[PDB]
Design a protein around this ligand. Structure first.
Ligand SMILES: [Mg+2]
Ligand SMILES: [Mg+2]
Ligand SMILES: [Mg+2]
Ligand SMILES: [Mg+2]
Ligand SMILES: [Mg+2]
Ligand SMILES: [Mg+2]
Ligand SMILES: [Mg+2]
Ligand SMILES: [Mg+2]
Ligand SMILES: [Mg+2]
Ligand SMILES: [Mg+2]
Ligand SMILES: [Mg+2]
Ligand SMILES: [Mg+2]
Ligand SMILES: [Mg+2]
Ligand SMILES: [Mg+2]
Ligand SMILES: [Mg+2]
Ligand SMILES: [Mg+2]
Ligand SMILES: [Mg+2]
Ligand SMILES: [Mg+2]
Ligand SMILES: [Mg+2]
Ligand SMILES: [Mg+2]
Ligand SMILES: [Mg+2]
Ligand SMILES: [Mg+2]
Ligand SMILES: [Mg+2]
Ligand SMILES: [Mg+2]
Ligand SMILES: [Mg+2]
Ligand SMILES: [Mg+2]
Ligand SMILES: [Mg+2]
Ligand SMILES: [Mg+2]
Ligand SMILES: [Mg+2]
Ligand SMILES: [Mg+2]
Ligand SMILES: [Mg+2]
Ligand SMILES: [Mg+2]
Ligand SMILES: [Mg+2]
Ligand SMILES: [Mg+2]
Ligand SMILES: [Mg+2]
Ligand SMILES: [Mg+2]
Ligand SMILES: [Mg+2]
Ligand SMILES: [Mg+2]
Ligand SMILES: [Mg+2]
Ligand SMILES: [Mg+2]
Ligand SMILES: [Mg+2]
Ligand SMILES: [Mg+2]
Ligand SMILES: [Mg+2]
Ligand SMILES: [Mg+2]
Ligand SMILES: [Mg+2]
Ligand SMILES: [Mg+2]
Ligand SMILES: [Mg+2]
Ligand SMILES: [Mg+2]
Ligand SMILES: [Mg+2]
Ligand SMILES: [Mg+2]
Ligand SMILES: [Mg+2]
Ligand SMILES: [Mg+2]
Ligand SMILES: [Mg+2]
Ligand SMILES: [Mg+2]
Ligand SMILES: [Mg+2]
Ligand SMILES: [Mg+2]
Ligand SMILES: [Mg+2]
Ligand SMILES: [Mg+2]
Ligand SMILES: [Mg+2]
Ligand SMILES: [Mg+2]
Ligand SMILES: [Mg+2]
Lengths: 122, 147, 257
RNA sequence: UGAUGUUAGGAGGGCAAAUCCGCCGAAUUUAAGCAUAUAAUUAAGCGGAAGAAAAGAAAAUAACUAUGAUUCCUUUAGUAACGGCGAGUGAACAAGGACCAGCUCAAACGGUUAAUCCUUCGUUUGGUGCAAACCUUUCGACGGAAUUGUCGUUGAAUUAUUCCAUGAAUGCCUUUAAUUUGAGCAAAGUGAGCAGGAAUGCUUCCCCAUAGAGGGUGAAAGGCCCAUAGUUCUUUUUAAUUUAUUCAUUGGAAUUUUUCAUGUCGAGUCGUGUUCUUUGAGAUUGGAGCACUAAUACGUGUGAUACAUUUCACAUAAAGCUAAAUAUAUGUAGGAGACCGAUAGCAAACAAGUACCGUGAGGGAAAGAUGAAAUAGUACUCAGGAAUGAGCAAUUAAAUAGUACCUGAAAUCGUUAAGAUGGAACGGAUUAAGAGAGAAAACAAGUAAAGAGGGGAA
RNA sequence: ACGGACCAAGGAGUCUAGCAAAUGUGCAAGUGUAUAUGAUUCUUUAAACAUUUUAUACGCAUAAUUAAUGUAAUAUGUCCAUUGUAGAUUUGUGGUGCCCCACUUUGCAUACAAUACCGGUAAGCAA
RNA sequence: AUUUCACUCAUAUUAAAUAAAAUAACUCCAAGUGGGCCAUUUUUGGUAAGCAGAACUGGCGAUGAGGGAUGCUCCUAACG
RNA sequence: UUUGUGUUGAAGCGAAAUACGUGAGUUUUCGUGGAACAUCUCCCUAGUGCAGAUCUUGGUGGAAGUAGCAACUAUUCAAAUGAGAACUUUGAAGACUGAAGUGGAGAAGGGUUUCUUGUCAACUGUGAUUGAACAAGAGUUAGCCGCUCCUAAGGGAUAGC
RNA sequence: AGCACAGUCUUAACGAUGGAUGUCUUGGUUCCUACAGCGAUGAAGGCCGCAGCAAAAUGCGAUACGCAAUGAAAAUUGCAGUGACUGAAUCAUCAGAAUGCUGAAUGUAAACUACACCAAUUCCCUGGGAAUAGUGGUACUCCUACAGAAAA
């Protein structure tokens, strides 16, 4: 790294660490940015995206559309929003996969676990 | 650097500079110093004449620290002094310098060259030669033996 | 270097003359399509290298001390000629003096923004622009060997004692730092070129007469070192030619054929 | 005194080897042939250990104004010396450095009392943990070993000056600085416009930096994400600093004074002769087999040429232990490079010591890439038994990217067109007749009237 | 006379030790900071920087010769620097055009010879 | 013998002619070669040989152009 | 080290040029391609330049629709199935093996080839609806048949040496 | 509706066969740093088994692609299923529990799931009540104790 010699800055090693991460570590990688309004209420800058949160799409062909996250796929590194759909060649309907770093979230769903995190993050 | 090597100039030529009729083969005359005294005799004789045979007595356990002895001639003997100091002695006439050459790494004083006329000097050393000691005496000096 | 015996690890031998094949050694056995192929030799697939590289290649060199010092001295002197500095690629058309000494308040700057403002106010804005625009991704196989970008060389800030220059002038693309008592030729002449742009603090500028024995001081002056001399007293030959003494000894101009 | 015992409590055996210890033991090759020599005190073979092993506290050097256990680095030095004196081979002392350390038996002395040691069974003090467990503790009993020898002293007394260990209670346990594990927090745009399927591009407008290492994200990102600079807690172990006190007993230890006593010091061992190996060691350097076989410190050994008679210096053999500086083609973990880039690099970038071959010991490959996304992998119609083909029908920016899927060369073959063609075909020089392309020299500055733009100055 | 049916990729004077000649560079009767140690060196840095607060580590050179005990380079009349022939450069006059001649002055490098001295050997003496 | 002083021996036509005579003289470091053959004239062995063995010079080899119909060595003549 | 090109299309590849150079080669156009590429300003460095080696690995030819698809006496008529029957099934003929049998039962070796059902991408050197091929399920029953026990030619060990 | 002889060779344009070239890389290679053995308390290696549908590789051991405990903490999936409004679904750590037949292999044997001798063995309640042909021990060499017997 920059100034500590005990960790690597090699393309090979940490490009290997990204694509074989254990499932527990993948949730920290899948994090999104907070809106300005939520950045005053909470001191935090970003959070790991969770299921029932609400988001705004900021990059891609579907930029500008809003909705609610319905599923999270830690193996493909993607999330799915409620009304952003697609047609297969059959005619069957599916969801379009969005990368969580292309998104800003505008409303949380809080519970016991996120409270103890937002408290420390202040 | 391989950039400047001679073999790159022969790179399109057939034989790499060694000849059509006489090849480049491996050891066509022997190995190392092989044929001396048989078919390498002329080279050995005109470039290293006294090579074969032995002469002299044996010395079984040498110990070279017993006979170590560096030398110095009387020419370099006034030059061990600084020039401004050399000036003062040539001016005054009732004083002379006393030089100890062993403190400078010399053991034997040797007698080549010319000392300055009528300029006494006193020299300390372990060994002296006859001519050196005569030259030191002639200009009015003195030799001293130390151990 | 390569692995010690690569390509020679098999029990192969040549079939001999007859059998209407070349006399290269061949892998024994049967039942797999490796059997009977050419085994080792610099012309065979899966064979060995011609002269396998070794670790006892002489990697470094030894350099005489006096020549090193002479070169450092000659590289400081080139840093003080306006024409040479310009020809190395520095954009200094707005500088006032090329030696460029600055007061000791430089030595205790603390934030990068202040250092950038200082550089701009001295007249080096178009030169710090040259550095920012220069970051590009390299061409070739170096990208696979941790050699991604390629940046250009800027000024070299030289100080005597550090109270914040080290950290403030870091993080700016192309900028180097050095302490006066440890001057490095690999920084003063990047890639062998001469005329690096250097910014000297006042204490750094003054220590330079003690380092080279103009004023003597224990543990600072280089011991018994003499500053080198030249074989020419004045390198202006066309001023010598035009002098009256020389001009009166010439001979009338002659004719071509 | 042998033996016996499914009596009680215990140990040895096999695997692994890069570095380490002991034995055994070649030839290829060089000598331009070859036998001594060299290869080599090597490869193959057999045994034994550790995080290092081995070596090691003088029966050592020197010959000086003298040094002072072992190991390793720089030199001594390709030197002294060995050799069909040929090819070839080859040490030691002094000097400069790393590190630094000294001890125990045997033998002498202790008999108004073996003082010594071990098994089993009890019991007794303080600490640490949730628990499991683990430290600390001086008391006893029965039994056995040992005088065919365990333990103490290190020649034994006497004088003075000083030091060490050992018990009682209110006794204090504070701050700081380093050395290592594991966690938390961690600035600054997702702003116009162009073109794009999609900006991380271009052009403009802002900013952060003790953070412009690296990776990810639909195309190149300091300000989109993980991290990065920094900082705060936490776990080890260790230096200072802070606090004692008043009382109790028995043992030890260094010198200093006066005396006596002058001891002991490693045997079929050293050494000599002879035979074979090994060494630079030469009228023999170390080791080994056989024969002979010592002396008692005034002795014994060494001082690089075989003897006899002596002088001088140095040391004290034939018992034992010991950290550091040194090595590491093995195993495991971490970091990195002017290294290779799928015929390259390890044999193996992939279900690689795998598939397959040999009765067996063994031998041993080939094989990477659609797209941003298949949470887009080909729906429907017509022909056909099917395979498959076609479309007005269909995903994609793209299907001449359709899974044998990036790009897609040469050898070799197909289709159409234009030519040539009496037992080879191509080619050099020189022209002509056809066919295909071409305006940058292969013509026209400027003037005048409009129309559409783009700059400079007062 | 031998190799070659065709095409693509691969494919052969290199590395280390030790010596010499040539050339470039630094210093010069000296030259080279060995192994180490030091530092307000520590991503890079395995680089770079430094040298122990009348100054004896070691190599090569400054002196040769002899098996060897060993011995060791004009010589004190003058800090002077052995002798001659040819010879670059310099000094003073004249000739023809700064150049070449003639005379005069100085005498590099080098070539060919002479002489003195040091080590070994022979000869003549020899305490 | 040697050494020192005196006097004197043709030059511009150069102590006989001629001369793309200094393209000279001398050191150092190295390559490749060490199986040859042919023609005129002289010449040894052999009946002789496109046989074997010597001498001087020129060539082929290492070299193409014009001629000898053809031809490694003949005649002319050597190469931007 | 300097100073440059690229989604308004890089490298690569195919055909070319009123182009430059004695030459090795530079440079440019059109097409395909879809992500990187230079530096000639001067220097450093090497696993740095192929027509051959009965060279190594991989791919492809003329020969050529050619040599060939000959042991074991031999086939014919009708019907079923099927997209399609000289070599699948049924009936009728003409024949062979000839008990020293292509008849029955075991050992060595093989390891599911056995059975029933399905079925044809490749194989079954011509065809194929067949098959020992491919797929899904099944199948081996012991006091009396054997091993297991005995000893042989022999093997391995113990005591000692 | 009509007109080109056939073969062979040459040149363009569009295709077939084949897998060079360019770009890519969770792989090699070398150097530097640190640490270091395992086993009768049964090792290294070998064989046999384990999933709802399960061949290889990877992981495990009759509790068998995983149990308990500790730190995170909602999902995990082809179908079927299983999970909260945090000992539960999944990841990591890994100290408790469990760990088939063998192998130095050690009761006797071994192209045998062959054959011995000694002790019957193991649970549940708190002396009763049950189950099971199931469990353990038995190599050789050697040391310290002990035991009796024998010679002298
Ligand atoms: Mg040539
Ligand atoms: Mg040849
Ligand atoms: Mg020859
Ligand atoms: Mg053949
Ligand atoms: Mg290889
Ligand atoms: Mg490239
Ligand atoms: Mg030989
Ligand atoms: Mg030979
Ligand atoms: Mg031989
Ligand atoms: Mg061995
Ligand atoms: Mg063992
Ligand atoms: Mg030891
Ligand atoms: Mg040494
Ligand atoms: Mg030497
Ligand atoms: Mg010998
Ligand atoms: Mg030897
Ligand atoms: Mg020392
Ligand atoms: Mg005793
Ligand atoms: Mg980036
Ligand atoms: Mg960053
Ligand atoms: Mg003794
Ligand atoms: Mg020997
Ligand atoms: Mg001695
Ligand atoms: Mg001892
Ligand atoms: Mg020992
Ligand atoms: Mg690497
Ligand atoms: Mg490979
Ligand atoms: Mg597009
Ligand atoms: Mg691509
Ligand atoms: Mg005909
Ligand atoms: Mg031949
Ligand atoms: Mg042939
Ligand atoms: Mg090639
Ligand atoms: Mg030189
Ligand atoms: Mg004399
Ligand atoms: Mg006398
Ligand atoms: Mg000719
Ligand atoms: Mg004729
Ligand atoms: Mg290129
Ligand atoms: Mg792309
Ligand atoms: Mg090559
Ligand atoms: Mg080729
Ligand atoms: Mg036929
Ligand atoms: Mg058939
Ligand atoms: Mg018959
Ligand atoms: Mg019959
Ligand atoms: Mg019969
Ligand atoms: Mg069947
Ligand atoms: Mg069937
Ligand atoms: Mg067929
Ligand atoms: Mg089957
Ligand atoms: Mg029976
Ligand atoms: Mg028997
Ligand atoms: Mg025709
Ligand atoms: Mg061990
Ligand atoms: Mg098992
Ligand atoms: Mg709990
Ligand atoms: Mg939990
Ligand atoms: Mg058993
Ligand atoms: Mg049996
Ligand atoms: Mg035994």
């Amino acid at each position: 790294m920059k100034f500590n010699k005990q960790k690597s800055s090699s393309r090979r090693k940490m490009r290997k660490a990204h694509f074989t991460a254990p499932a527990g570590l993948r949730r920290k990688i899948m994090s999104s940015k907070l809106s300005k309004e939520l950045r005053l209420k909470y001191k935090t800058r970003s959070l790991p995206v969770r299921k029932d949160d609400e988001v705004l799409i900021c990059r891609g062909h579907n930029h500008g559309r809003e909705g609610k996250v319905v599923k999270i796929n830690r193996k493909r590194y993607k999330i799915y929003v409620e009304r952003v759909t697609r047609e297969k060649v059959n005619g069957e309907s599916t969801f379009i996969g969005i990368h969580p770093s292309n998104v800003v979230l505008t409303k949380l769903k809080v519970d016991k676990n996120r409270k103890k995190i937002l408290d420390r993050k202040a | 650097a391989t950039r400047f090597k001679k073999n790159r100039k022969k790179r399109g030529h057939v034989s790499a500079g060694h000849g059509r009729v006489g090849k480049h083969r491996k050891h066509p005359g022997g190995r190392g110093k092989a044929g001396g005294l048989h078919h390498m005799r002329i080279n050995f004789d005109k470039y290293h004449p006294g090579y074969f045979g032995k002469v002299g007595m044996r010395h079984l356990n040498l110990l070279k620290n017993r006979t170590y002895c560096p030398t110095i001639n009387v020419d370099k003997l006034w030059g061990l002094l600084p020039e401004e100091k050399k000036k003062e002695f040539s001016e005054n006439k009732d004083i002379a310098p006393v030089i100890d050459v062993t403190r400078k790494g010399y053991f034997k004083v040797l007698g080549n060259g010319k000392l300055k006329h009528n300029q006494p000097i006193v020299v300390k050393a372990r060994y002296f030669s006859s001519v050196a000691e005569k030259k030191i005496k002639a200009v009015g000096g003195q030799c001293i033996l130390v151990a | 270097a390569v692995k010690l015996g690569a390509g020679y690890e098999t029990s192969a031998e040549s079939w001999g003359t007859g059998r209407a094949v070349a006399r290269i050694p061949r892998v024994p056995g049967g039942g797999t399509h490796r059997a009977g192929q050419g085994a080792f030799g610099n012309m065979c697939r899966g064979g060995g290298m011609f002269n396998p590289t070794k670790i006892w290649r002489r990697w470094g060199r030894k350099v005489n001390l006096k020549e090193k010092r002479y070169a450092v001295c000659s590289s400081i002197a080139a840093s003080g000629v306006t024409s040479l500095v310009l020809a190395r690629g520095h954009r200094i058309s707005h500088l006032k003096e090329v030696p460029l000494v600055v007061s000791n308040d430089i030595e205790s700057l603390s934030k990068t923004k202040e250092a950038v403002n200082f550089l701009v106010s001295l007249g080096l804005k178009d030169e710090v622009n040259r550095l920012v625009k220069s970051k590009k991704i390299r061409a070739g196989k170096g990208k696979m060997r941790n050699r991604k970008y390629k940046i250009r060389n800027g000024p070299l800030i030289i100080y005597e004692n550090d109270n914040g220059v080290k950290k403030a002038f870091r993080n700016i693309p192309g900028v180097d730092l050095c302490k006066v008592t440890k001057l490095n030729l690999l920084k003063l002449a990047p890639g062998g070129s001469i005329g690096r742009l250097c910014i000297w603090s006042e204490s750094a500028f003054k220590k330079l007469d003690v380092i080279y024995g103009k004023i003597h001081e224990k543990k600072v002056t280089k011991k018994n070192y003499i500053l080198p001399k030249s074989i020419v007293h004045n390198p202006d030959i066309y001023r010598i030619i035009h002098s009256d003494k020389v001009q009166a000894s010439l001979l009338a101009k002659k004719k071509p054929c």
